[PDB]
Design an enzyme around this catalytic site. Sequence first.
Site, PDB file in Angstrom:
ATOM      1  CE  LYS A 186      46.528  60.488  42.052  1.00  0.00           C
ATOM      2  NZ  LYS A 186      46.351  59.488  41.242  1.00  0.00           N
ATOM      3  CD  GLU A 261      34.795  49.300  49.333  1.00  0.00           C
ATOM      4  OE1 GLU A 261      34.950  48.108  49.180  1.00  0.00           O
ATOM      5  OE2 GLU A 261      33.899  49.419  49.708  1.00  0.00           O
ATOM      6  CB  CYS A 295      39.960  44.342  45.301  1.00  0.00           C
ATOM      7  SG  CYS A 295      41.076  45.763  44.754  1.00  0.00           S
ATOM      8  CD  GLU A 392      44.586  42.347  46.126  1.00  0.00           C
ATOM      9  OE1 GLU A 392      44.908  43.502  46.343  1.00  0.00           O
ATOM     10  OE2 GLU A 392      43.434  42.062  45.858  1.00  0.00           O
TER      11      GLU A 392
END
Lengths: 489, 487, 491, 491
Positions: A186, A261, A295, A392
Amino acid sequence: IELKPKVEAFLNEEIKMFINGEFVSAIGGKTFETYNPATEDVLAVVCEAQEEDIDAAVKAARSAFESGPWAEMTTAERAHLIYKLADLIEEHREELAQLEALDNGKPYQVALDDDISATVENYRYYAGWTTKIIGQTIPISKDYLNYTRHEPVGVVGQIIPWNFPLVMSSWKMGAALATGCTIVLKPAEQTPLSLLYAAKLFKEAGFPNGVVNFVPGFGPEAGAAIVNHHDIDKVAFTGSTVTGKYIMRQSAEMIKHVTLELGGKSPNIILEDADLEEAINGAFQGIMYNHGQNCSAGSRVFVHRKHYETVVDALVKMANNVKLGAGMEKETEMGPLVSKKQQERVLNYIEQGKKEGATVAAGGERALEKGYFVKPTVFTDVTDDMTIVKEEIFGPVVVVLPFDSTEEVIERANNSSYGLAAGVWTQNIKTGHQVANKLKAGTVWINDYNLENAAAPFGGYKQSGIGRELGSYALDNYTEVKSVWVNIK
Amino acid sequence: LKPKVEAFLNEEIKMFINGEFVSAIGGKTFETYNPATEDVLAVVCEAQEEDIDAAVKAARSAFESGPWAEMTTAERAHLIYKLADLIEEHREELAQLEALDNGKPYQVALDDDISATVENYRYYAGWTTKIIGQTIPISKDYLNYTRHEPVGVVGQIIPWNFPLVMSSWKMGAALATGCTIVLKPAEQTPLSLLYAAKLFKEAGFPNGVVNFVPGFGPEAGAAIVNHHDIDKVAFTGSTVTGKYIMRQSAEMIKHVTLELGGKSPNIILEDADLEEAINGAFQGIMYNHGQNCSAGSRVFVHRKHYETVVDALVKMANNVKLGAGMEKETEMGPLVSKKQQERVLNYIEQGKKEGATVAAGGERALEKGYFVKPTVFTDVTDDMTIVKEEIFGPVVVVLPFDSTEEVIERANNSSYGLAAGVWTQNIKTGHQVANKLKAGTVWINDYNLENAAAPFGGYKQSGIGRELGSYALDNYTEVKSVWVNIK
Amino acid sequence: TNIELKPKVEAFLNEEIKMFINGEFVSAIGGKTFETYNPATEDVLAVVCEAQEEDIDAAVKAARSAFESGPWAEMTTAERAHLIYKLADLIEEHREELAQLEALDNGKPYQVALDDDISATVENYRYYAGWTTKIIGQTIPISKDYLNYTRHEPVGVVGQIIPWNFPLVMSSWKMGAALATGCTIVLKPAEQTPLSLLYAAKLFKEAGFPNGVVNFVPGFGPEAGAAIVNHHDIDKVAFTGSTVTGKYIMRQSAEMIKHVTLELGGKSPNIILEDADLEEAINGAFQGIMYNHGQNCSAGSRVFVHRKHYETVVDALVKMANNVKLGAGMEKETEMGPLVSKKQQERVLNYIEQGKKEGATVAAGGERALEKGYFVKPTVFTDVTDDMTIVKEEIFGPVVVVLPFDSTEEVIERANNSSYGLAAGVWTQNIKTGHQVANKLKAGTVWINDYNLENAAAPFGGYKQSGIGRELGSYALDNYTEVKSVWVNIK
Amino acid sequence: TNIELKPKVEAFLNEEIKMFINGEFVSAIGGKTFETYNPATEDVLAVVCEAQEEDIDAAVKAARSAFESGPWAEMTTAERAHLIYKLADLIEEHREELAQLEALDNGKPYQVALDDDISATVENYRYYAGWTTKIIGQTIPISKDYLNYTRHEPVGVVGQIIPWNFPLVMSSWKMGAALATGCTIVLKPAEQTPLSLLYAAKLFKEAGFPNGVVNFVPGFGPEAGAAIVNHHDIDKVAFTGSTVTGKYIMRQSAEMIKHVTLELGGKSPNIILEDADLEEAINGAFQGIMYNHGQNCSAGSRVFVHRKHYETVVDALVKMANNVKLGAGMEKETEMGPLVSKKQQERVLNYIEQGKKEGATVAAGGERALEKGYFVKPTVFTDVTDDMTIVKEEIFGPVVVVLPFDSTEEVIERANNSSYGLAAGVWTQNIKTGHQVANKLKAGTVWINDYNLENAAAPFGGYKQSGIGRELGSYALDNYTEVKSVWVNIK
Ligand code: NA
Ligand code: NA
Ligand code: NA
Ligand code: NA
């Protein structure tokens, strides 16, 4: 840059899903829209996968894994299919890069040179592994023959995000296909076009029906149905640390293997003996590459006190000089953030930064008439407990901190729930290796930054993930070890 | 009773934290029993949440600095090899402890459990110096290499069925990678691990490398799994607890390796050597009183030989000599606890009431102790509870089949896939079946074999990951990719 | 102050020294014996039974039989490992006995034999005992119709010949890796230094090795060595020694299509670039050559110094050379012992003369030392050019050659122009220059900011004429294996 | 029924056949030529440039240069991989052309050259292209003070010599693995069959191989072959051919301490036990020897049969021998071609006479066949014994020897009583005895219930005098590698 005939043709119609070899609409006919983030216009209308379409893709995958060509085919033949896929992706490089620049927002040229060639190279690399996924012969006793088999898990469920859409689809499918697994993938609601155009390339290369199944949609429906599907053997995910927890919690009911991840807050450290010129560029590219929607961005630039002023100045100048525009515009260096939601998130991280005591040396607001743009930003006068230095942000937002000793910078770099990557800049042979050994990160670049390669593994320590993608290591996530004992008296 | 175990049982049993034998900070204790007699064998210091926080601090500290963190791989190897020697020197002491605390016959505890534990630490001692990463040729501009670095502090929980050996399955691989450990033994069998603590100190393990913390599951066990400073977690036990352990590990993107239940098949095809297969089918389930995750609790037998094997399994079921583990004539001991005996006796009732017939056993044995008679069920369907669910006792279910494609499908139609056995004299058919079964380890013409060198673990709901072999090192390793710009 | 003879070594030295065949201590079938000396005093140290072809033949027969059948063929990998481990414990237990015999028979300082030699050999056997249970083959997925797998089988009876320079550790280099695979052994120590090994035989027995697994046959190259090289029933051969004898071995082995492993000499370069931490490199340059009286195949006999540092380095190497305390390996004050033999003393003194004849200057040393014993003074040569005999040829003594250079590309080219390529050392503080230079050098081992390091887990061996194959590490196991590929039709 | 010659092969034969050096197609410096024949008709098939010693120096300079600088040295591994893969695609594009050359130049049937040889060579290059990116060394954890890593460095210029029996696929066995490492090559095809590889040279230019990475030099063993083996600048030598020349190569290679790889002859045993699927085993025994007319190192020239089945299999092999359709390789009817040469036909006809002279019986064949060409009839020998020349020596034609046996331990003794040990076959339906017998056989490849299966992923090579080292699989890469151990002192 003008639209390629083939993208024009692909965008002139509703975008269909790919299940059991055919391009199809959703069973109940739902559709959604994907935007060009430089203009805010609708780019395409896409068929939306529901719980029921995910069931249809899983069935297709299950049936392709058990009977059929994919199941009988030699390891050499399978390698050839994967290599043929890469040739085709390379044939369609301009089309894929245009789709990527338009739908995701990044500059065309870098999608051509980085993304597309990296996805090509990743399938070439994994095509070579099909024939080399070896098990062991273990000498124990002359009374038995002991061997292991590395059998593919079967049907795997993969969810990738929006920031490196096509390449991220190869990180998950190269390794999985090479083991002989079957896929239900997806794409992100924000960027489904690249992979749905790539679909026709999987067919043309000769992939048997159901080996690969692409389902665009939303997490609350298509994503959830993937993670909760009883007949899916293993799951793999890239995205926010928050959703990886959910996926790991939901995977516990079936005791299903998981690969995750996730985010980071990676450090890029400049020590006293660094070659400063190379390191200022590294620090700058480190955070600003792909608009910081990476990331592994080097979001915390640590600089030895002696050079702090020098690098804050250089990084402000660079930040103010970046060229914002639409990705299809040839002179664009940085495009916009991918969505209204993302722009609002990162702009809010900026306010948060401001009202917690930090200062905006550069950027720190929106840019241009329309589009989800954010000016590259440099935060100064920073503290370790500040929200902007722990969390983040996912934007072109860097935080720069001074330090006085090596022991100190190692402790502060590691003081994070994240541990994905790190950068160390020093000309010293001993301290480069010492510092890299002590950093609690999955990848470490000594005197460089933001490098990936099909052959070198990638993944995080701590809450930055579980497992690795790329290299030989990624094969192990798609495998199930069987230990056979043959009694020979 | 050996003098060193007499001295050990004469005092309250202390936990082992940061190189020292300690009591629980809050002073609580719990009782461990002898399952043959139902008496208290020992009182043991009970680890609370705060004892787990002390063990983790000691572990964290021994990994970040000091001798364990500074030691060459050859020096670490020597320590592990020396532990193996010490466990071997105390083989009789540990064997007695196992028999008394777990219930199993002394001689099998000595010949299997203790020798397997010694073999495991010698094997893993051998890996410390051999845990290599890669050099990756990519580009002349870079030097690309990977380090296999130890995760850090590991949380380990082990069950009661093979108490000492499982402490090795867990610790040998972790310790070989340079990891530091916090381990909770089962509350039913804390003794052998806690006696072996002596041997970690005597071998020279620096303080805090290893920390033994006995207690209960909802206190010490949850403290380990929920602890903010534990870097990785490994568990063996039920599939229902395994789900809980993975749910809670999720909050911190903590790696999990789990070894859980089974309902493994043992298949006797038509061309099997029937005499060897009957004995394998029987040992397959009855070994360790059926308290074995990989037990062959579903014996599938080709129709042509069904009745022959049922007669033989019934005969052998009633021939088993039941008694206390410390008596020499004993072949099978009791079940570990009152709760367990109730559980397996209640699975037997559920089988009768569902319409299966008990061809042998099916009830308690003797005057005291948690004993259940070896039991053989016939007239069973795949549909029945006794055939889907792990009973964890000396209970076997025998199932006729007519074709190889049928048996493969019925064996695989399970949520479990820990192990399987296939009995056939034919070369081709042996590997075809082996390949086709959804099971972590397949035995062809044999059953229940384990070895330090051969990986063990389950497919589907029998687990995540593998223990033993080279494979096990990976669970305790964190892979770092280094790129060095040399252009 | 003499280091006192150990009781068990006196008992040993008191009897004739026997061979070790099929598990028993035996004299030569012919009853011949030879003498071994103490290279410090020149006295006879021991009388040793001398293996002839007939004796080598019985060693092979015992070897063949222990391989084809019996306990060693039947043992599990864990059992084998345990044997190898028990052997290392016993060597550690007899550490003092063994280090004295090394000091006594070879000549090296006792303390260095203890600390280095003996503990390297203990550690090499422990490393390899660990491989025993882990020599794995492959399961190769090719097609669903077959099961494809490999077996790494032991070759069989292995003929091994080692030199005199590191007698016991060199025995472990050969036997650890071979025994781990499950091979059987016929081993020959050097005529100059048989005692470390023949003593160690007690320990193979005491460890419980079955008979014939290990066989020690001391003697001379033209008889015992050649009998091993030529034996029809020896499956594989491994050698360490002169590059001249390596050729004879590799030539003879042609007749039987026998796998050969060779470790031979060198002229390893030790390079000090401008950015070296100089104090360190000076100590590495000096130890790189002077360690083991230069009787080291990987001795950094060519010390390359960047011009900025050349004078400084020479001055320091001269002063250090002249401060070395020469004496007997059994005297405590001793830092460097004598050369192994009269023949070896004559060889290096002669290489020194050739040095002077060709134009080079002797900055230190250059002659015999002391009143008796095979001693030579640590030697420093300056005013040297790449075409000189002494900078091209292996001397095998405490003799160094110091050469200035003016650029990195220059020093790489000059380092590499040799038929040798066993080792190299590079000293630089720069992260890039370090690995760049390491990659460009044609050598089997490169040390960056270090020199003379060995460890069981790290391969060692030469490129070009310094050898074929590798020893130590996982790599060494392949030399003792025969790969078998099995295909199983599964229809 | 003639197969029509492909126009691209017609154009190629219409001219003098050039050699390939430094990316260019050239003639011999001296202008010399030799002829290759069509072994079916005996006419001259082509005139080919004959490489003299001078031509081998040129090939080596260009290889040497391509290894030290230029794109091949610079290229990333993904780039080298991509050249090898493009080559494989081009070979596949030219499948018919290459198979026809094989059929015309070597003699074998077209359809089998196509299906087996060409397809396997494409697949071998595809497999090896996959290896370029995955050739890894190790990082070894020894202590906190050092970083220990190894590099698998390509050896450099490699000299390769292949035979005539499977020309193109043997070219890929050698080059795929060597190129994957990053080596540079000089390859001599056999005198009887240079066409295949000199045609494939077009495909190396077109794939974009840099000048000098590959150099094809055709000619005679005593000039070009010898020049490769004795060249001071070749870093490694690989060879497939006769046990006798393998000895010569090893002997000469001693002089430079140059690593050798040898894929030599065999006398492989094919064992039908009492419990075999006799249907499949008779076909296996038959194909095992007759495939490629017996011109196969791993041919099952010794078919061992349990006494219970001896007569049944003798009778079946005789019926099948008398039925093979002999003819030209370019005729569609053909099941078996001619032997490669006049000399090879005389050699097999001679062995057949040696067989009758020693007392064996010809149950079929035993003589020449057809009018012109080098054919020999499929031959089956019986009433044979172990010490006979025919059951001991490699004949290298379609000539089989069937031997009855009575027990399992017996047949293992007799199969292993050989200096050869390349391959073996074992037929039994029993799981236990299948692996037990495979375990006890001294052969590099054992096929359990099959015979003559080779795949790029599985290693192939011999034990004993059948060779040194292995080719194919991961294992072949090590033959083209040089292991470097880097130690980085990090305080
Ligand atoms: Na979009
Ligand atoms: Na108990
Ligand atoms: Na001596
Ligand atoms: Na020809």
